Design a protein around this nucleic acid. Structure first.
Lengths: 63, 70, 102, 46, 99
RNA sequence: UAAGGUGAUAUGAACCGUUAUAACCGGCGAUUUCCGAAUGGGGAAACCCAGUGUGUUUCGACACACUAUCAUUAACUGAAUCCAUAGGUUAAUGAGGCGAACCGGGGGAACUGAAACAUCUAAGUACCCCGAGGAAAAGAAAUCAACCGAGAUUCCCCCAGUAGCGGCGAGCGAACGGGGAGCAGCCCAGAGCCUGAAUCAGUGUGUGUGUUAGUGGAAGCGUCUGGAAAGGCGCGCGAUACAGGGUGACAGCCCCGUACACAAAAAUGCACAUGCUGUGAGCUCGAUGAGUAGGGCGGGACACGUGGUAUCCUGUCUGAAUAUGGGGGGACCAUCCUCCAAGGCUAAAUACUCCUGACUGACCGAUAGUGAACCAGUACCGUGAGGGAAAGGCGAAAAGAAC
RNA sequence: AGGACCGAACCGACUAAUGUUGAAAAAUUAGCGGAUGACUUGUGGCUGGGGGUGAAAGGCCAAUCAAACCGGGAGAUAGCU
RNA sequence: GCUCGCCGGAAGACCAAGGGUUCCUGUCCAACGUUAAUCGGGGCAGGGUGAGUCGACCCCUAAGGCGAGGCCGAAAGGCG
RNA sequence: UACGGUGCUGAAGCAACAAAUGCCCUGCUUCCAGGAAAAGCCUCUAAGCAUCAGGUAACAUCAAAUCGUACCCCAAACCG
């Protein structure tokens, strides 16, 4: 949920969720698989959050 | 480089044999070595002999050691 | 940003459609403020040889920018600039100089 | 006779050598004029 | 097998090309493409831990495919880079077709 | 604050979210595909491989983490040499890396005004090269005079274009003498008494106030003509608001200004008050680091361009004396005078506007202006080193061929 | 054996002829050698201003350089229509 | 179909000057093939060139780069 | 049959004769202008390990280190 929503969490998505959150780009983002009436381009409009966890990790270890 | 106690010298000037004639006189071209330092050996010690001429009140150091100080 | 706030009712006066009045509007960055769509006889294009071939000639982007009138209600287009005071705690909604807000 | 213009990579180093033109003060000024102060690009860096 | 590695950017989608028809017979010599990160070692480590599926040999391919979109003669090249990967003998598509 | 947005110049189309984190502005952090200036070594600009760890793996591997050259200083260590010392394995900390140019350093011409060209003018300028900061260079005197006196330096008009040097050639071109601007002094070489007392490099806090968002901001209708009446008349009102230019034209009148009232996180200006890590504050008694200076014969810059000769300079070399004076008196020496003992510090006058900022324009309104309106130093030529264009500009809504 | 006598593209430079109003600051056609090396033959890196290698040239060396293709000196000198 | 050409020390071959992706084809006429234009690497819609062995890494060297300490150096710089 | 092609099925299968450009030949000869080092090839030992370690063999395996590989040449996207 966009990243700032779940900041109560003890562990970042790097623990396994990093790949479960990234896999679709090789599994569903080919022709009409992920969708055609109802999805398309995701990873900006909605799905960007995986990248925040990156700079946030370093924030948390650098404190 | 030689007299280095007192630092360096090669000042391009002339000697006017037909008025303002550019013949560069001032370039020195002779070198000497070897004298006894304050400790033990007849060390490498560079001069022309100027450095060692300058020794009539030096006690091996009060000018000698400017290259050796830093 | 305009504190006159996207239900409200405006008119054309600083162009030929002089009096065409309507509400809510359409607001986008450097968008031309159509009042409600003041056009009458201007074509539409055919980028599709399929059945749906856009047959329009009416409403399309009739420009009259920003708003020349502080929201109509009865007569008069001013003072539009007038900032107003505390009503929402993170924004301020306005009407015109004479009548608190809306 | 063999006249003239052609491209190569290994002839560059002593003349058209891009980092050699940063190493000489001769080159350095011209580069900075031609794309740092003067609005522009070079990009032919392969 | 590791999770801290170049994998999550080194791949793209499968390449869907006709050669899946013409050369997959008693083995699954299936096509991919890959980003600017691709040395062979990365794509060798990749497939089985990103798509659940066991493989044998891997090829990397420097493809340099010119494009133009600007009208005026030119556009770009991008990374482009095809690859070939190897779904063994007979597990073919037997649950999904990732086409 | 206030609502929309997805930095665009095909926008199709996904999809954040108009609750008070969607974007976006702002204090301060944070991000690496690899280069990298890049620095283990290599370098043909985008690098191809050393050498040693660490968390941990479906135990293949994995992403990563660092060093160099110097300049100074503690520790360990170390040669032909009992000893000296050079030199290593380190630990510590910074600069080495980068600018059109200012200024400090020196070098830097060629031919050409002189009607002849070896003086010189050319030019201390082309460059190339070394510094290291925002201000400098300097600057606390053998400085200048005539016995009158002045005081770091020199600066401003003079005196004066006077002295005053010459292929007697063309240029260069001084100080005094007067008015002023000025308007203030000391520590080592070191010991006693005294002793966080003066400054300031830091670094936390805080007032007095900045930087900018947030707060704002002026008046009109009726009519004759009428695409826009934003002209004209009416004055039905106005003024320390009548910039320029916007809104399809010409709007005091609708504007966007100007004039005026309030005003933030959280660093941080400057000024001060405090806070704390370090400094030196008050008084005496002491002390004086010469190869430097000479000159006979060199190279020189000074007003004095070759000369009898002028220093304070510079170099082979030789080589004195502590203020019971001589260093020098713009020849040389008197009578006499003034700086001063040859370590080191100083308030003002000056200059670079990197760029962005406020006002002015008998200044450029593309024969052009900072090479520069551009997105032209980009492309039309180039062994190339890179010389750079011909070049303003549809214009309610792109209203851009419905039919 | 021999810088043979006569031999191939790797060599040049004899006078024409369609080379001059160019296919070409250079090359040509039926013709013709030096027959193995006083040959030339090509990736690069030393010769970077008044040049530097000598079959020894006033030819070179960008294609026409007694010094340019430099742009900085400088919109010089200027007895110049 | 049917009758013969040109390159004949082939523009036969794959691949090295980095020029770089503009072949089969699917489609065509300015942004040009000084006739036609159906073809030219024209130029546009797809995609592509699958190297553990090919070769330059290495271990490495005759020419010649850079080089401790240096002998010297005006700042430059040069020879190791 | 997509008019490219693969779908089924399938023969026949010996002796000589003459000649390289090429293979053997870092063979073997013939002449001097006198054809460059490390290394793979193959062994000697210094020290130091030396009831430990080293390498050479049968077999099982693993790693097999960023590239480029498209059109193109005794020669039109080099140059002209």
């Amino acid at each position: 949920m966009k990243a700032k929503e779940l900041r109560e969490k003890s562990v970042e998505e790097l623990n396994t969720e990093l790949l479960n959150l990234l896999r679709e780009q090789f599994n569903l983002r080919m022709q009409a698989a992920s969708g055609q009436l109802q999805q398309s381009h995701l990873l900006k409009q909605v799905r960007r959050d995986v990248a925040r966890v990156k700079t946030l990790l370093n924030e948390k270890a650098g404190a | 480089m030689k007299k280095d106690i007192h630092p360096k010298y090669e000042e391009i000037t002339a000697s006017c044999s037909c008025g303002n004639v550019m013949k560069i006189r001032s370039t020195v071209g002779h070198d000497l070595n070897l004298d006894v330092c304050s400790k033990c050996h007849p060390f490498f010690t560079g001069k022309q002999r100027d450095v060692a001429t300058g020794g009539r009140v030096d006690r091996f150091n009060k000018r000698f050691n400017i290259p050796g100080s830093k | 940003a305009a504190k006159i706030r996207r239900d409200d009712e405006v008119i054309v006066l600083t162009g030929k459609d002089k009096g065409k009045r309507g509400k809510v509007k359409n607001v986008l960055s450097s968008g031309k403020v159509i009042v409600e769509g003041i056009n009458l006889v201007k074509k539409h294009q055919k980028p599709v040889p399929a059945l749906n071939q856009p047959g329009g000639i009416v409403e399309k982007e009739a420009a009259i920018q920003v708003s020349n009138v502080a929201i109509f209600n009865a007569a008069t287009g001013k003072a539009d600039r007038v900032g107003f005071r505390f009503e929402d705690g993170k924004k301020v909604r306005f009407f015109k100089s004479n009548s608190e807000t809306i | 006779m063999k006249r003239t213009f052609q491209p190569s990579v290994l002839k560059r180093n002593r003349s058209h050598g891009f980092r050699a033109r940063m190493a000489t003060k001769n080159g350095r000024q011209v580069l900075a004029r031609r794309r740092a102060k003067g609005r522009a690009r070079l990009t032919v860096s392969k | 097998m590791i999770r801290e590695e170049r994998l999550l950017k080194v791949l793209r989608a499968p390449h869907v090309s006709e050669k899946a028809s013409t050369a997959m017979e008693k083995s699954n010599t299936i096509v991919l493409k890959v980003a600017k990160d691709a040395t062979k070692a990365e794509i060798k480590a990749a497939v089985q831990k990103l798509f659940e599926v066991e493989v044998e040999v891997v090829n990397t391919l420097v493809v340099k495919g010119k494009v133009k979109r600007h009208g005026q003669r030119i556009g770009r090249r991008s990374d482009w880079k095809k690859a070939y990967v190897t779904l063994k003998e007979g597990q073919n598509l037997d649950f999904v077709g990732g086409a």
